[PDB]
Amino acid sequence: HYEEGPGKNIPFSVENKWRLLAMMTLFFGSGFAAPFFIVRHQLLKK
Amino acid sequence: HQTHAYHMVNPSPWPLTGALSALLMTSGLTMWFHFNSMTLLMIGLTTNMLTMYQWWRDVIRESTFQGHHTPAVQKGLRYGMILFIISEVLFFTGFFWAFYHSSLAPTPELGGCWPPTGIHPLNPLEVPLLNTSVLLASGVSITWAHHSLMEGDRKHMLQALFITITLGVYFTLLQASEYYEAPFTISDGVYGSTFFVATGFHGLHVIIGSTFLIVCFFRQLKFHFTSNHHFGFEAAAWYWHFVDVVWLFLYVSIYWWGS
Amino acid sequence: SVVKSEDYALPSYVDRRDYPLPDVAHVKNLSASQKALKEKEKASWSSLSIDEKVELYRLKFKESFAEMNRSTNEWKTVVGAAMFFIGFTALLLIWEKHYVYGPIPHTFEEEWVAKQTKRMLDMKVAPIQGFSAKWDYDKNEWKK
Amino acid sequence: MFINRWLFSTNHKDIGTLYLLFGAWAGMVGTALSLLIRAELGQPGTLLGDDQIYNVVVTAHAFVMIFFMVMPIMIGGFGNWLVPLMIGAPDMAFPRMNNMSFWLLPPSFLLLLASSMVEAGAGTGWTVYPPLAGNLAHAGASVDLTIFSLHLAGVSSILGAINFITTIINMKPPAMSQYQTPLFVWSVMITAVLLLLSLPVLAAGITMLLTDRNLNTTFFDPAGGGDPILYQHLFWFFGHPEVYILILPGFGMISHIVTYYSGKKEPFGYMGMVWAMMSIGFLGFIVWAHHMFTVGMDVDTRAYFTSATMIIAIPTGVKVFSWLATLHGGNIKWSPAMMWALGFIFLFTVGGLTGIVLANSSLDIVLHDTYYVVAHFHYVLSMGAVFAIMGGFVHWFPLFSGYTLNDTWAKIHFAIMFVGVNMTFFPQHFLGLSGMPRRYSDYPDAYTMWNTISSMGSFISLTAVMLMVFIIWEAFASKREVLTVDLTTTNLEWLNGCPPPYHTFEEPTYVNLK
Amino acid sequence: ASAAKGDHGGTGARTWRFLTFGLALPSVALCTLNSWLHSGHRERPAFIPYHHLRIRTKPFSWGDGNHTFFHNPRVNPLPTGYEK
Amino acid sequence: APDFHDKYGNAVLASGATFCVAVWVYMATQIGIEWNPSPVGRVTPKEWR
Amino acid sequence: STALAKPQMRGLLARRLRFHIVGAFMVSLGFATFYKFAVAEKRKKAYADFYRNYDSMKDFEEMRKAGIFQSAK
Amino acid sequence: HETDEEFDARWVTYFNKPDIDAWELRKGMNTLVGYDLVPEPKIIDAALRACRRLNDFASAVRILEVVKDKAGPHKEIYPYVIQELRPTLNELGISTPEELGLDKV
Amino acid sequence: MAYPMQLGFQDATSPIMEELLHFHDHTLMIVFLISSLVLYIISLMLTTKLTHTSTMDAQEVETIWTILPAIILILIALPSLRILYMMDEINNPSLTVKTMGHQWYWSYEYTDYEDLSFDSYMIPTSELKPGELRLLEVDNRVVLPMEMTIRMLVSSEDVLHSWAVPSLGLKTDAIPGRLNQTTLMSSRPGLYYGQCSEICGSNHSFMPIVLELVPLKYFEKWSASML
Amino acid sequence: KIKNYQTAPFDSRFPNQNQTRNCWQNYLDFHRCEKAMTAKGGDVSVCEWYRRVYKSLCPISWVSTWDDRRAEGTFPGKI
Amino acid sequence: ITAKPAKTPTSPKEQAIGLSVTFLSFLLPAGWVLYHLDNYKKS
Amino acid sequence: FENRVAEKQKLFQEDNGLPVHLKGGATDNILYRVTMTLCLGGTLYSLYCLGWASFPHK
Amino acid sequence: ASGGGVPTDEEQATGLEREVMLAARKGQDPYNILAPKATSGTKEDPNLVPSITNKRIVGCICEEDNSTVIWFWLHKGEAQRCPSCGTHYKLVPHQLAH
Ligand code: HEA
Ligand code: HEA
Ligand SMILES: CCCCC/C=C/C/C=C/C/C=C/C/C=C\CCCC(=O)O[C@H](COC(=O)CCCCCCCCCCCCCCCCC)COP(=O)(O)OCCN
Ligand SMILES: CCCCCC/C=C\CCCCCCCCCC(=O)O[C@H](COC(=O)CCCCCCCCCCCCCCC)COP(=O)(O)OC[C@@H](O)CO
Ligand SMILES: CCCCCCCCCCO[C@@H]1O[C@H](CO)[C@@H](O[C@H]2O[C@H](CO)[C@@H](O)[C@H](O)[C@@H]2O)[C@@H](O)[C@H]1O
Ligand code: CUA
Ligand SMILES: [Cu+2]
Ligand SMILES: [Mg+2]
Ligand code: NA
Ligand SMILES: [Zn+2]
């Protein structure tokens, strides 16, 4: 069966807070960056 | 061990393959409309069929073979099917609204009349009347089928269900032939637009409903249904009456009143 | 005293103004002298000392009303920190002005504005209340 | 193991969590798009380019905030986590179909991103009106991708609505009548009914747009006898119920949050609250043409839509007053969740009231398609729905995760957000009254002051959004494990611990009929 | 209404079969007769290039882009008129 | 026993307020932002024709 | 060594509510009076006074001589 | 509902039940403080005597605290009540929260 | 036009716009009163240590809080609907003018007697004459007679637009295949500005409307000189 | 003769905001009248009122397309 | 609510790091895009 | 035809720990692998297609 | 006109469906389909709450038509009282599956 309890009912690891910081940073930061890069992509076509 | 009566389902890949197949079909349509290619689309349609097949197979495994469909579970499925049908009614409603809007206020481009200048409607007393008698008759044979199943009569169930499906197939063949014979097309302004899209989604529902009946027919051949437990059959029957009733509204509105 | 995760289904202790008598004692296990104290509590309370009374109270409850209802200096941290981040936002605006925004249109130059303002006045823009109404056409100046 | 659990889930808590993750990621996208808007408008002139790129940004902003952030968080996230727990059900009725509602969302979002990458994107407004959205003024794949995106999100929500309705009607303890279910559960059921009825009508309308664009139908094209106005009616027949869909689960969480932090065992006037949500749900289907007061409609139609729109104030006023009456006499806990809720009550009321202004078609002639409309809906959405989501998130995060947030940080976050959204939207009322239109990349010089202030406010909200991420990181980084929760006797969702086990209510609750 | 027949003592399988073969299928047989009689190709109308008809705002994604999906040469003119 | 707020509250308030005022006053007045205030009582109308 | 008087002990929250809701009502009337004087009447009298002796031809003539019109020099 | 005197008598009787148990003691107090009133001295008198029969000194003190709390900013109430309770406090040997130092933060 | 830091409506130029100002003052007063009462009650609910947490009876105070808002709505709807029907009243115009939306400019047609029509485009920022308004000026203004009832007919030849002039209380969508009617009557000569008010693509922001109101005699000579 | 026209008057048949049908109907009436007059041996001048009304109301591009369509044999209205 | 003390306490310093890294992950990529806007707008 | 439901009930209730979608035996596994391959493959291909469509071909 | 060949639930129902059906025949409710009827709920006549473990969540609707349900864990041992109305409940642990 599955792991249960705090920090185990989630699809990401919270075992190491620094690795977690990196993941959260990539995850939220990719979301926030995407429109800027899409704008840039549109700008650079015509 | 649980002491309630509901079904905890085994973790399943079909939701994911279902969702991806929706991505492949919509991408595929886009690719087909804009980049002259059918490949994404065909792959989407294939995974879609595979998903439906396995998912519903599993539902049959869970119920007929494993016994998870207690009355509380069956009652849930009932509400599910009723709600689904309601959502399908509202979908059609939008097409009828489009039809009544254009045909009640025909614009100057049409000649300011309905049917538009240069449109020659099908005679509603011909094949469309036949189509009506076919669906109505299929509502009767499917009721005979239901009653036979409840009375425990295997042979007459199969006979009435077979008749029902033959009628569905008949309607479909008549409609294919009408589509081909029609002197107006989907590109003939709002008349052809409302006609083909409305009756076209309807024809699609007849095909789904007939398929659902065919599944019931094979499940019955394999003895899956009991005289009291046969929700797959009731659901297909509800869905069938729904398809019949939409036809009646199409007939009265578009073929008869809109001619 | 010590509360565990796997006790969530048990009656628990709380300090709340509106639930003065919680479902369990703050302290359930008793030392030897604490047991003797619970015995002495069965006789007249007048023979209990002040210290003993306080100790009975602290066996039963964790914080007094005065302790639980106390106010804190949290507001200073909250307000000060909010001002800090709002402050930090102005740095982002400064960066944006310097590196992202070009010059604004020439219609904001002072002479353009003076000319536009005369023209708005000549056209009696908002003459009832909004704009021209504020200009004295007789004395040729803004209404004092 | 990982794939079985997170890609093949049939568990309502895990699926809730996937929704919240998806919703939080969408929120970052929606925030970025809104900063692009406000950077373009932050000084007079052209920053990005002409109105096309600009309105591609505006259109994506709206779609992302509505379909990818708010609905998934409220309905998919909170609905899935809390509704089965609040009625003591072992899961949703259709646990596997529930998973497909989730997995339809990433593809739907991918289609939206695709439309903004191909050609020049869909710069149509989230309403996607023809003929601008047609195959001549928006040739190529962008609008078709947007339509298909909406189809997928629509299917996701219709199957979700069927799942919630069945679960709530069918899976309560046998002794629990519908008048013993919590207000949040009511709010989600009413939301699901509106979804079931309204999304298929949108689906019909956009399918007709799709066929006009690709199959030479002419539903919306005058040359074949169609009418662009028919699209507006089909869209708004969905779109007004849609805004009630966005706020109803928020009303539901506000009721729990306010009852909870007031130290109350129950919300004031329970049956009044059920009545008010039902009335609002029903009335929200008969007012759609208030979105159309300038298209040229008969005077009596306009009189009817003005009057029927206004009547909505009455059941909504019952809720606002019942929230105040729930606070009354409370042992008030000043928690971050409660601050969110108190801001909700006030700011939602403001935005509701400016909606009442707009309901008057006479005045709406002058306000329609101006920033007065933008100010109205951002009070109810970016303060209303968003505050309800933040309130709910901080209140229930310890249930979902088993960890606590730092309350001081959460209060700091609230304070920054509150200043930011008000700075952003309040000056837009002035811009609207004085005539600044919607969907402009640039404005006459007179409007410069309020636009500058408004952009500054949006930067302050950005700061609150970044701080939020840090705050969630800090909770997970520190691992303060929850011990005791108060008021479990009237908040069943907490009674199995934090986080609750994977399988809860394997043995159902015992409730006597008496 | 009440139709013009009777039974109602108990609607069962026997009754619904009675209706299937005694009423519904005979109706289908009658309409089939009626249809496979009033058929026969009616003479196609003069072609007039009305602008509200034969709409082409974008080529169809099949064939040469200019034929509808169930194009019938006999009865469906192109925007430039009937085919050869 | 004194918590974070007892020990740092006054400093976080004082220096947070000071920082926020300073950097907003600077941003508002020193970097070329055009606020476009009312001409009323400030602009002398000049001939344009 | 004086006793204290029995104070009011019941309905303190209700009493406070009543007092302040009645206060809120009085403030609302005072604001309605104020607003219907500093805003609504002010607006009607500004329009009324503006149009009382307004001469549209003289207004046009001033605009014309200032050179604003395409159709009138 | 009922008159003030009937309400008080009902609560006096509740707490005066000779064999009142610990659960009823708590249930009574925790219910009582939900109401919009500070309980009359006679009600508190009976609740304190119930604490005595249950051998629970600490709950007697907590009851006096909740009286104070229920008065909110009406600072005249709590000392009036203590004044009225004084013979009972002396008889039972109940020290007030103030005499115990429990009013200090 | 709007002026810097404007808070409210542009000054009314037509009797109808004046009517909307008074009706908005009336509604705004109600909005302030209700939202300030809500804020006040919130603060009242939150500023006491007195508590009352037991079950509160609701079916009494619900009357007040349904009847009072009902009365308030009727007090809004009454003047709202009076103005709505006023705006619909038969007036007999002296003149009919058409405007057609385009990407991205307006055309005007005055075809009562002669065949007059012309295009009206934004003056580019680089070509403004001194004191002209960025984004607002057009090359050819809509000259109209002041103090006269004019019927404006609005349509489009491409996508949706919307024809608006805030000072006159006007906004009428421009829909292809459709001919929408509104009436216009300026109490004063002058220049009255508006902007396209339906998203219509790349230059939506840059297709303004400028009305020039002058005496009938000047309007007639201008019309003739414009053929 | 009975004229002195300023613009098309209020017509109780088309009292609302959408005037599309007013334009259209007056266009058809003018051309119907024109055809009746040109045929039976009479004068087009009796058609004049319809001509003025439709000219006032109808966008130039509509009248112009309708005229091209009548010449082409594709006008969908009945004249 | 009551909770246990942090299992892995996050000190003032560690918070300053997570907060810096968090803000940077939002500010740097958008900043880079915005800063190079002109380079994009004509190239 | 004869009623063989009892045989299928025994097969699908076998206590072998298989999820229902694999419990029919080796063919379930094959059909699952075809489906998931087509879906994952098709999705990568749709991403390739977006990549292609995202750029002008002048 | 008539014949057979359709299995009945008695012959063909299986798994949990079959268990619910056989239990209902003996008048039993091991899968909690029905609402239990309250006893008077006194100390002497407590509501008897079956369970397969040593605690179970009770929800008490204290008075007919209350919309608020009071939820608590009921543990094996002495009768517990609803914290709102005091009615008594007693856990009666074990079995169901023989
Ligand atoms: C959460 C989303 C949300 C909600 C809840 C609402 C709620 C309401 N909205 Fe709004 N609205 C939008 C989101 C929402 N809106 C959006 C997104 C648009 C723009 C669509 C677009 O074009 O893109 C829009 C547009 C819109 C328009 C069209 C304006 C235009 O385009 O010209 C109108 C017109 O009537 C309107 C009205 C209302 C009204 C009357 C309510 C009412 O439900 C509010 C009722 C609430 C209150 C009144 C406050 C509480 C009550 C009291 C304290 C009691 C006393 C009050 C009185 C006595 C009046 N809204
Ligand atoms: C839910 C809806 C929603 C929300 C929240 C917002 C939020 C914001 N919007 Fe809005 N906006 C719309 C829906 C919304 N918007 C719609 C529908 C339109 C009309 C589109 C059209 O015209 O076609 C629009 C239009 C619009 C315009 C007008 C564009 C124009 O007319 O040209 C502007 C300009 O200022 C604007 C700005 C903003 C800003 C600055 C925010 C900011 O306040 C945002 C700050 C960020 C947050 C409030 C969100 C974060 C929440 C999360 C990140 C999830 C957190 C995660 C968990 C709790 C797990 N928006
Ligand atoms: C025989 C009766 C049964 C009907 C089904 C027939 C099979 C074709 C497959 C499509 C089924 C889909 C249903 C409805 C879709 C729209 C139009 C289909 C109705 C139809 O078949 O119309 C045909 C037009 O075909 C066309 O363009 C069709 C071209 C096919 C393109 C399909 C377009 C797909 C559009 C996808 C939209 C899906 C979105 C739905 C969302 C549901 C909610 C999410 C009529 O032919 P014609 O030559 O113009 O006139 C006859 C002249 N002799
Ligand atoms: C070319 C053809 C392809 C076209 C595409 C669509 C294709 C066909 C779809 C046809 C649907 C087939 C559905 C078969 C479902 C079989 C599984 C089933 O029927 O499962 C039953 C449960 O019902 C249930 O889940 C109820 C399941 C209900 C499914 C509803 C089906 C509608 C699908 C609509 C999708 C299209 C969208 C519309 C487009 C606008 C099992 O319970 P029982 O029957 O009581 O058995 C148990 C007894 O044996 C015990 O004694
Ligand atoms: C709307 C949300 C966004 C709000 C505003 C963003 C806040 C500021 C974040 C700073 O981001 C960086 O700023 C730089 C300058 O400060 C950049 O350096 C650039 O400019 C330099 C300094 O001139 C060079 O050293 C480098 O080559 C480089 O490209 C740039 O790369 C960027 O990452
Ligand atoms: Cu034309 Cu916007
Ligand atoms: Cu609406
Ligand atoms: Mg509009
Ligand atoms: Na700009
Ligand atoms: Zn109870």
CATH architecture of H1-105: Alpha Horseshoe (1.25)
Amino acid at J1: K
Q: How far is D297 from chain J (nearest CA, A)?
A: 6
Q: How far is CA A30 from CA D26, D28, D467, E30, in A?
A: 11, 9, 16, 68
Q: Which ligand is nearest to the CA of C91?
A: 5
Pairwise CB contact (< 8 Å): K40 & A32:
no
Which residues are bridge partners to D481 per DSSP? D403
Tokens matching residue H70 = 């229920």
Binding site membership of K18 for ligand 5 (Cβ less than 6 Å)? no
Q: C57 by DSSP, 3-state: which?
A: helix
Q: Phi and psi (nearest 5°) for I47? A: -115, 30
Atom 13 of ligand 1, nearest CA residue: D377
Task: Say if residues G19 and I43 touch (Cβ distance below 8 Å).
Answer: no
Q: Phi and psi (nearest 5°) for B176? A: -60, -45
Tokens matching residue E46 = 């003069």
Q: Which atom belonging to ligand 5 lies closest to the Cα atom of K29?
A: 33
CATH architecture of I92-227: Sandwich (2.60)
SS3 content of chain D, % helix, strand, coil (to 5): 70, 0, 25
Burial label for D407, CB within 10 Å (0-12, 13-18, 19+), is middle
Which residues are bridge partners to D448 per DSSP? none
Tell me the count of D-I CB pairs closer than 8 A. Answer: 252
Task: Identify the chains in contact with K, defined as 3+ C-beta pairs within 8 A.
Answer: A, C, D
Q: Which residues of J touch D292 (CB under 8 A)?
A: none
CB proximity L27 to M under 8 Å: no
Taken in order of first residue, the domains within chain D and their CATH numbers are 2-514 (1.20.210.10)
Q: Which residues of J touch E48 (CB under 8 A)?
A: 73-74
Residue closest to I13 by CA, chosen among I225, I126, I201, I166: I166
* Other Cβ atoms within 10 Å of B125 Cβ, number: 15
* Other Cβ atoms within 10 Å of C93 Cβ, number: 21
Tell me the technique behind this structure.
X-ray
How many Å lie between the centroid of ligand 3 and the Cα of residue I198?
A: 33
User: What's chain E's length in residues?
Assistant: 84
Atom 39 of ligand 1, nearest CA residue: D355
Q: Where are the alpha helices (DSSP H) in C14-109?
A: 32-40, 50-60, 65-68, 74-99
Residue closest to D58 by CA, chosen among D437, D325, D452: D437
Distance CA M58, CA M91 (A): 10
Domain-wise residue ranges, chain J: 1-79
D380, D382, D421, best to mutate for ligand 1 pocket (most atoms within 8 Å of CB): D380
How many Å lie between the centroid of ligand 6 and the Cα of residue D478?
A: 54
Residue closest to B95 by CA, chosen among D227, D204, D206, D148: D204
Task: Identify the chains in contact with C, defined as 3+ C-beta pairs within 8 A.
Answer: D, F, G, H, I, K, M
Q: How many helices (H) and strands (E) does chain H have?
A: 5, 0
Pairwise CB contact (< 8 Å): D481 & K9:
no
Q: Where are the alpha helices (DSSP H) in D328-447?
A: 336-359, 361-367, 371-378, 386-401, 407-433
- Domain range for C97 is 1-144
How many Å lie between the centroid of ligand 2 and the Cα of residue D417?
A: 13
C115, C117, C129: best to mutate for the G interface, most G CBs within 10 A = C129
Q: How far is CA D96 from CA B1, B75, D9, D13, in A?
A: 20, 17, 7, 13
Q: Which residues of J touch I112 (CB under 8 A)?
A: 5-7, 55-56
Distance CA H99, CA H103 (A): 9
Atom 10 of ligand 1, nearest CA residue: D355
Q: M80 by DSSP, 3-state: which?
A: strand
CB-based contacts of F30, cutoff 8 Å, min separation 6? none
Q: Where are the alpha helices (DSSP H) in chain B?
A: 14-34, 39-60, 71-104, 127-150, 154-181, 189-221, 231-250
Q: Into how many domains does chain M fold?
A: 1
Q: Which residues of M touch B67 (CB under 8 A)?
A: 13-18
Element (H, E) at H10: helix H4-16
Distance CA D361, CA D297 (A): 11
Resolution for this model in angstroms, one decimal place? Answer: 2.3
Q: Into how many domains does chain A fold?
A: 1
Pairwise CB contact (< 8 Å): A36 & K33:
yes
Q: Which residues of F touch D436 (CB under 8 A)?
A: none
Q: Which ligand is nearest to the CA of K34?
A: 5
Q: Which ligand is nearest to the CA of D70?
A: 2
Taken in order of first residue, the domains within chain E and their CATH numbers are 1-84 (4.10.95.10)
Q: How far is CA H64 from CA C24, F5, G3, H98, in A?
A: 19, 31, 19, 10
Distance CA I148, CA I153 (A): 16
Q: I88 by DSSP, 3-state: which?
A: coil
Task: Identify the chains in contact with I, defined as 3+ C-beta pairs within 8 A.
Answer: C, D, F, G, H, J
CB proximity F37 to D under 8 Å: yes
Q: What is the CATH number of domain I2-91?
A: 1.10.287.90
Q: How far, in whole angstroms, is CA H63 from its chain's centroid?
A: 5
Residue closest to D310 by CA, chosen among J22, I80, H17, I112: I80
Dihedral-angle region of residue E54 (phi above 0 means left; psi in -120 to 50 means alpha; beta otherwise): left
Query: Could you tell me the fold of the domain covering J1-79?
Result: Arc Repressor Mutant, subunit A (1.10.10)
Pairwise CB contact (< 8 Å): I1 & C18:
no
How many Å lie between the centroid of ligand 8 and the Cα of residue L28?
A: 55
Task: Say if residues D479 and D442 touch (Cβ distance below 8 Å).
Answer: no
CB-based contacts of D46, cutoff 8 Å, min separation 6? D40, D441, D442
Q: How far is M10 from chain L (nearest CA, A)?
A: 13
Tokens matching residue B238 = 């509800």
Q: Which residues of I touch C65 (CB under 8 A)?
A: none
How many Å lie between the centroid of ligand 2 and the Cα of residue D33?
A: 8
| Radius of gyration, alpha carbons of chain G | 30
How many Å lie between the centroid of ligand 8 and the Cα of residue D293?
A: 8
Burial label for M94, CB within 10 Å (0-12, 13-18, 19+), is exposed
| Radius of gyration, alpha carbons of chain K | 19
Taken in order of first residue, the domains within chain F and their CATH numbers are 1-49 (4.10.51.10)
CATH number of residue G39's parent domain: 4.10.93.10
CB-based contacts of C28, cutoff 8 Å, min separation 6? none
Distance CA K22, CA C139 (A): 60
Q: Into how many domains does chain L fold?
A: 1
Binding site for Na(+), residues of D?
Answer: 40, 45, 441
Atom 24 of ligand 4, nearest CA residue: B232
Which residue's structure tokens are 């928006």? D138
Q: Which CATH class is domain B1-68?
A: mainly alpha
Among the partner residues I4, I135, I180, nearest to D442 by beta-carbon distance = I135
Binding site for Cu cation, residues of I?
Answer: 161, 196, 198, 200, 204, 207
Among the partner residues G24, G35, G59, nearest to I188 by beta-carbon distance = G59
Pairwise CB contact (< 8 Å): I111 & J55:
yes
Q: Into how many domains does chain K fold?
A: 1
Q: How many CA atoms lie within 13 A of D468 on its CB side?
A: 25
Among the partner residues H35, H69, H73, nearest to I52 by beta-carbon distance = H35
How many Å lie between the centroid of ligand 4 and the Cα of residue B168?
A: 17
Active site members of D: 61, 91, 126, 156-157, 240, 242, 244, 255, 290-291, 316, 319, 438
CB-based contacts of B227, cutoff 8 Å, min separation 6? B149, B150, B151, B152, M6, M7, M8, M9
Distance CA B232, CA B239 (A): 11
Q: How far, in whole angstroms, is CA D255 from its chain's centroid?
A: 17
Binding site membership of D38 for ligand 3 (Cβ less than 6 Å)? no
- Domain range for M37 is 1-98
Element (H, E) at L4: none
Element (H, E) at I209: strand I208-214
Amino acid at F40: V
Tokens matching residue I31 = 């909005």
Among the partner residues K2, K27, K34, nearest to C100 by beta-carbon distance = K34
Q: How far is M18 from chain L (nearest CA, A)?
A: 12
- Domain range for G42 is 2-73
DSSP single-letter state for residue I133? P
Domain-wise residue ranges, chain B: 1-68, 69-259
Helices G12-38, G40-52: axis angle to 10 degrees equals: 10
For residue D499, say if its preceding peptide bond is cis, omega within 30 degrees of 0. Answer: yes
Q: How far, in whole angstroms, is CA D181 from its chain's centroid?
A: 23
Q: What is the pairing mode between strands I142-145 and I208-214?
A: parallel
Among the partner residues C19, C46, C64, nearest to H97 by beta-carbon distance = C64
Distance CA L46, CA B28 (A): 8
Q: Which residues of G touch D329 (CB under 8 A)?
A: 13
Tokens matching residue D341 = 């809720």
Element (H, E) at L52: helix L26-53
Q: Which ligand is nearest to the CA of D124?
A: 2
Tokens matching residue H30 = 């925790």
CB-based contacts of H57, cutoff 8 Å, min separation 6? C41, C45, C48, C53, C56, C57, H51, H94
Distance CA J35, CA J37 (A): 5
